[PDB]
Design an enzyme around this catalytic site. Sequence first.
Site, short mmCIF file in Angstrom:
data_model
loop_
_atom_site.label_atom_id
_atom_site.label_comp_id
_atom_site.label_asym_id
_atom_site.label_seq_id
_atom_site.Cartn_x
_atom_site.Cartn_y
_atom_site.Cartn_z
N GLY A 124 38.06 9.62 -53.83
CA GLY A 124 39.15 10.56 -53.87
C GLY A 124 38.64 11.97 -54.09
O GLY A 124 37.47 12.20 -54.35
N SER A 142 34.13 6.37 -58.20
CA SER A 142 33.78 7.77 -57.99
C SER A 142 34.87 8.79 -58.27
O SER A 142 34.55 9.96 -58.51
CB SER A 142 33.34 7.97 -56.54
N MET A 143 36.11 8.39 -58.26
CA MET A 143 37.15 9.16 -58.94
C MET A 143 38.18 8.29 -59.61
O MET A 143 38.83 8.74 -60.55
CB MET A 143 37.85 10.13 -57.99
N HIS A 199 29.43 8.62 -59.62
CA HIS A 199 28.37 9.46 -59.08
C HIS A 199 28.86 10.90 -59.10
O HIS A 199 29.89 11.21 -59.70
CB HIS A 199 27.96 9.04 -57.67
N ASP A 217 24.53 6.87 -56.40
CA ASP A 217 25.56 5.88 -56.70
C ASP A 217 25.06 4.89 -57.73
O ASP A 217 23.95 4.36 -57.61
CB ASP A 217 25.96 5.16 -55.43
#
Lengths: 217, 338, 187, 148, 133, 222, 179, 162, 193
Positions: free
Chosen positions: I61, I90-91, I115, I164
């Site tokens: 996102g 990641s979000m 990340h 990641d």
Amino acid sequence: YPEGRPLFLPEAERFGNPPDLPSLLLQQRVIYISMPFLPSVTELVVAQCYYLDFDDRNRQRPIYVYLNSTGCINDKGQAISADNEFYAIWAALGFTRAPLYTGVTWKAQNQAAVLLSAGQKGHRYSFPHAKISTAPPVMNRVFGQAVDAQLQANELDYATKYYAAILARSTGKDLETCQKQYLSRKRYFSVKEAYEEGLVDKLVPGFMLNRFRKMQK
Amino acid sequence: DRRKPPPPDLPSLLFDQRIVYLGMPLVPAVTELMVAELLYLEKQGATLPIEMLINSSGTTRQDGEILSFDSEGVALTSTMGFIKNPISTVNMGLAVGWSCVVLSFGRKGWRKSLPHSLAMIQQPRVPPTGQRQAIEVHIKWREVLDYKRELLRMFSLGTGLPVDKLDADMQRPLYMRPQDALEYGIIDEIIEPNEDKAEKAAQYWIRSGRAESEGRLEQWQEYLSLQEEYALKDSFRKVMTQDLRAAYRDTSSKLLKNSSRNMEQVQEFKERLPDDMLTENDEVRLPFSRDGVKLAILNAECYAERNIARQVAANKVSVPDKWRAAYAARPAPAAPAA
Amino acid sequence: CRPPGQRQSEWVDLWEAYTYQKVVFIKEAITEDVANNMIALTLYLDSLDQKRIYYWLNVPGGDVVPTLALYDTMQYVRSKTATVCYGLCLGMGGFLLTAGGEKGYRFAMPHSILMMHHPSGASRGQASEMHIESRELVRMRDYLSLLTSNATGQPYDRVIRELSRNKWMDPKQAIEYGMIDKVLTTP
Amino acid sequence: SKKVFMIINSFGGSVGNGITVHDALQFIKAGSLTLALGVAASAASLALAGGTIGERYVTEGCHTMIHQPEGGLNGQASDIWIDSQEIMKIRLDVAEIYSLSTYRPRHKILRDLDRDFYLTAMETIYYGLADEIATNEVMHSIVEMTNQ
Amino acid sequence: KKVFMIINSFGGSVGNGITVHDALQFIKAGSLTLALGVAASAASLALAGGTIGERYVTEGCHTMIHQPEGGLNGQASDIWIDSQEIMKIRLDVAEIYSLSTYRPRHKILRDLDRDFYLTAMETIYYGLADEIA
Amino acid sequence: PDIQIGHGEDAIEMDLYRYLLSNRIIFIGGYINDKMATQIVGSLMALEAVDENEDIRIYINSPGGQPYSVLGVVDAMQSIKPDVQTVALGACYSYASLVVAAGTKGKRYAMKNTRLMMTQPMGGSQGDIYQIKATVEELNALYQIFSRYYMKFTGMNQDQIEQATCRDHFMTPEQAKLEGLIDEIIRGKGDYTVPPAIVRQFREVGLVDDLTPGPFLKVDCN
Amino acid sequence: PFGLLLRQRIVFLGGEVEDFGADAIISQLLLLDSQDPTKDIKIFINSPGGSVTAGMGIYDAMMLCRADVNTYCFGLAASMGAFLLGAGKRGKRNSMPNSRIMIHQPLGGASGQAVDIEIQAKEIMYHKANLNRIMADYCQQPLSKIEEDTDRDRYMSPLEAKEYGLIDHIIGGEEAVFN
Amino acid sequence: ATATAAPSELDDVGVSAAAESIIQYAINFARASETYEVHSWMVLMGILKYETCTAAKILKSLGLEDLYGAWNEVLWALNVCDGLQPRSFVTDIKFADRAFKVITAASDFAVWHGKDKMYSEDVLMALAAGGVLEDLFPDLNLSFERVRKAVEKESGRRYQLP
Amino acid sequence: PNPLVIERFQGVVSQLFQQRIVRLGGAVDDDMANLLVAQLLYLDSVDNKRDITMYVNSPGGSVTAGMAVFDTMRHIRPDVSTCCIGLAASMGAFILASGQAGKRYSLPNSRIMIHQPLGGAQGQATDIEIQANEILHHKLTLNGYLAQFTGQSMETITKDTDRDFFMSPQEAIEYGLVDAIISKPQMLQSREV
């Protein structure tokens, strides 16, 4: 190793005719500008000029510049290239020595019309149905602040004053007058209207119509 | 001399003087041409040298768009290993990725570069697999790993640096100017501009009177003034920082703690005395700033417009209206407010 | 496979150099273009003199009308024809492999892969147009099957039943089936 | 011909190529006479400033536009950062090259590369990127040198 | 006088590898095959096709070995026929590898199953190459 | 996987955004194009017609807007009766930025982690010299209008706006509160983390150094 | 929310004006007239242009309405919204202090046999004359000046337009009129 | 020849314990602050650190009583006037122009001074001839020639130069 | 997707929302974040005390839209307990991190990936500096927040999120991103041994 010197027509008439057509025209000192003033045409014309003023003995044999290009602006009125391609061509054609005769086959428009006018006085030719037209210079779409657009306006005003200077020298009119008549709006000239204003001077030499020949037979 | 005609074009003209010009992204056609030319130049003699010019962006565009593979460079570099006559590799412009290995893979002491050329090294990337199985993803990674290790080994033969250091540096783009490449190990020399040219240029700038009066002096004065002004401003910032630390030490000399005894305890037996460790645990000392310089005179400036403070004493009981749940914070002999 | 190979005195292209020796390399699936080039080459090669024309085929397939045109041109020329199979001959290529030199002049490389299938085609329109096209395509199947049967020596009815689907052959199966005559080896 | 005449008319090109041509022109022993026809953009302005000082000609109708390096770059935050720092280093390289070619301070050059910057013939010669107006006699003699 | 085949091919259809192998064996004076960088399947066959005793690989080179690939489309019986030929191709490739490596053909078939990578020394040991540059 | 709405679940169960607009909340998302400006002005005037004295709350999370649509929205905001109370979320990128400054002074808010931005009006010249002069006049008129609105709302000098708009100027809520674009920052449950820009401003005045950076984010790697 | 405003006799004309957009607005004005003949309508114009045909359709609808039809421009009114804004009842045209008003000719084209080209040139010339004639009447300015002005590509502030005769009131009392 | 800038010329060359310890400490300090490049002020800090060495004792006689204070003054000047900015990781600690010239000058001094080894007093003269002493303590009037006479008096042996 | 799937899912979404369960699915673009801000504001208005349960199942996102959701979570009155099911990447992983301390959960078989922001800088050198400062500010802000949530240090976080960093929920608990695992007892299979 040895410096291979290009030998020219007086001494190269013994080496035969050139193979193809563009080599023929280059040998005849004709620079046929059939394609809009793209960087390719500019490069080719600069090289032809460099070769023609390279080893002419008398360099009084005139250079012919026939035009079939709408200059630096596309058919639909939006610039296809910039005004600097014209300057490079024009500048190049000036660093030679020979009188520069210009002619129009079908269309000399928007930059090629100026380059048409810029031939020798008394030696600008056209076909009797050539269409000549003068339009204001056009820039291509760029993005930015008000300052970038102001810079483009300044550049375009240099270009407009440049073309007005050449047209004033060619048509023998007041500089601002030439700016108003030609560069202010996209205006069309027939061959007779263009001759009336000093754009062209003559038809191509020897132009004789078919039924006219018939009735003189 | 007539028997060998002048060369038809420019690539023949250069290659006739044993100059292999590598100037294109290292695609299979470019790699094949390079291999053919190097083998042919060994054929004409394996003692004569080869001057390889490298203005190339490796196996991928600088945009990042993969365009060959990690094995075209292995072919070219193993070729350079195969040919035994000396190779001097000059870097022109750009030498990225494998084209950097090739620059560092020439004869040592003969690798050179132009004064502004850039030599970048990064880690190989591969085009998207396209949703393969699990074992094929593992196998593709083992392929990519073996080729990255090949790149590392060849770059270790080039530079001189361990494999682990190079692997760590490669993880991100590493950009090297010729000073930096010369430091790192990529190149050995830098092709300085011609001295006679530069001397004549300086003499022309002086003699013609252009360097003096074309507007140059006014703005060179402006440049030096801006530099001096900004240096002085940064010195004032440093002075502000040092005075803040001196205020912290002024207001920290009123303390009663036993934690210093613990910090004595934890340290080693040798450092039972204060004995630093020649490392980035480095205590810079401000208080011995008795410069006493009588030469640096204060300029004609008036700080006498600053007011006259109330001249507060800190030896009060009054405290700022705050909150703290600790009741070990006893009033100090010098700070009854603590 | 570009580099011009030297000839009697100059540098000439590899495939032109081959045709200077009557050898005609067919390497692309037979479309209108390649078929026209090879028909033209065959006619000119027969024009120079009449010795023999070896066709080295690597054909992976092709269209039916151009292949039959090439076959008829091969049969029309005075000079005899031998067909060798370098690589593979599929479909109409496997039909060209049975187009030259019935008398024991079809060769194949040891690992060449041979395949024959009934000619394909596709066309639509009116109802009657489909009748005309379908009748013509059945005529084409029958003609190519007559040619295959008289080339290999297999019964016509056998060929009809066999080639309705794809038919694949190793050179030993092709000798045993009559498709080819000899397998090239180191000699 | 102990001089290499280099004729300039080009609307752009990556600045790294201009740096390469500038370094090469400053490296060869033989002199260089660089003529600008019409335009000389970023890389062409570097190639024009790269000739022998005193023989960098520009026509009356030429324009010289110098702009800071422009780049594009995608990836993670650290990759954007590293490419950013490199592009700034290229901007400083170009500013220093112009500063040494024209004798202007790097800070006035950097101030000018802030935005696209167009210069006429007089403006270009005043600024220092070129040294003489190209009159017809100039490459009268240039052609005669190539011929003699 | 001997065809000297420099090999650096990241891929290719396996049938073309067979065809080049046959072309190599066709000429009688021996063939030298020097692999650089990579020799994938269609070129691994070519590398194994050189003269035993005169096949060289470079320290950096990696050898790919895998079974052929294919796409099929049609009726069920067309799919069956086409599967049968791809199996014939895989059997032929295993036979060529067996001729060059002198290793159990069933073992070579097992190793073909998935993508198979060999370093230069493993290329020497397997038998596809003879010496190191 | 476009979007999935609650309903609020009254006896009607209408769309969630209709419910929020009925409770006097206008959401601005995406570019303020002509449709978005029309919708926002219609919402403002409908809410005015319902009750001309009670506050309207506007949430602004938008990456820009057409300048004329933004000027229309700001004119409608300044020309209505109720207090307009603008909370910035996510981003407000330069034209939306004025929409944040146009709330009733004292009631302009920004969430703790939004990113405001200020830019000169960007447009674009093309064509004849008179079209380019028209573009210059359009972009100068837009610069004057937006500069005057920023002066009106934040009190800055036209010089200060010249520096704050000469290039894309990304601001945290803290610069916006120092400048005057917003009035209060909506924090967490006691969240006072100092953003990297404010840490750099600490470093520029000598409060923290490389030796003693303090308990702030490490900006020594810049 | 637009339902409540349509109950309040407020019609929105926002975004590009087109054939279907016109038909919708024409119908709304006819409904508001046939429901109530004595209570004014307000039309809000934020539109960057439109089609001359659709624009003249809406203009005819506006001129039919017995109930005086005020207009209130916000943001943009470009060369066809501006004409409609000038076609509100005199004395009841309003604008925001910082709206931008543009007056300008339409574009066009033609193709093929130039018979249709001359017919298209004649039709574009008709549009020019038609629009300018009514513009001159409500701006209360000489037709020659209006013909000259409708040529020139230019925006104007509501102060300039209020001087020029197009609009009659500025909502904001000219206290937020910025140049 | 620039081969004098070599680790051999630091180890292999016959030097006293004092000069070798001074140079090794300067190199330790160049590595410590992570700026792999020895400055002439780090060499002076090497002299001031070893208060027992005769060079630092000659400084005491010339007016530097606060030798620990002088060391800290030099370190503070290095942090402020110059820079202890940590760099990246250079495998080989480098040497600044002044510092390498100071090494060459100290050996040249030892030659004209008769000492078959390179001594710390010679290093101190090399620093003085490079300003470093007067560039840092202008209050004490401690220039190249004053310490020239100071070391002449200390060793009692006349020294002469080209 | 199929309209009937959309209609069924919108119905079950309304039921869950009735039960005070918002959900964050798919890439968190501006539209989803505006919607989820609206839902959170509504749930605050309805009741100021009861917990909200926020279903995180996201592959990524936008940083900006994620921070819109994150500030609204930290501003409203009810404690937003974030629960991860499937993939918080990641979000949604940052959002899951920012759930009410002690009330962030994850089903046992989920993956958390944290990340640094992706992005892109384009234009002249100065525009690239401005845009690189925007991306670096976002990276520093998110790492500072992850340090606040997980109890780790800013440097450990910055080292861990460079590339990641996939984590099982067990590793997430042991890290600090998640506070408990949701699972019911199974039947421990007796082995013959």
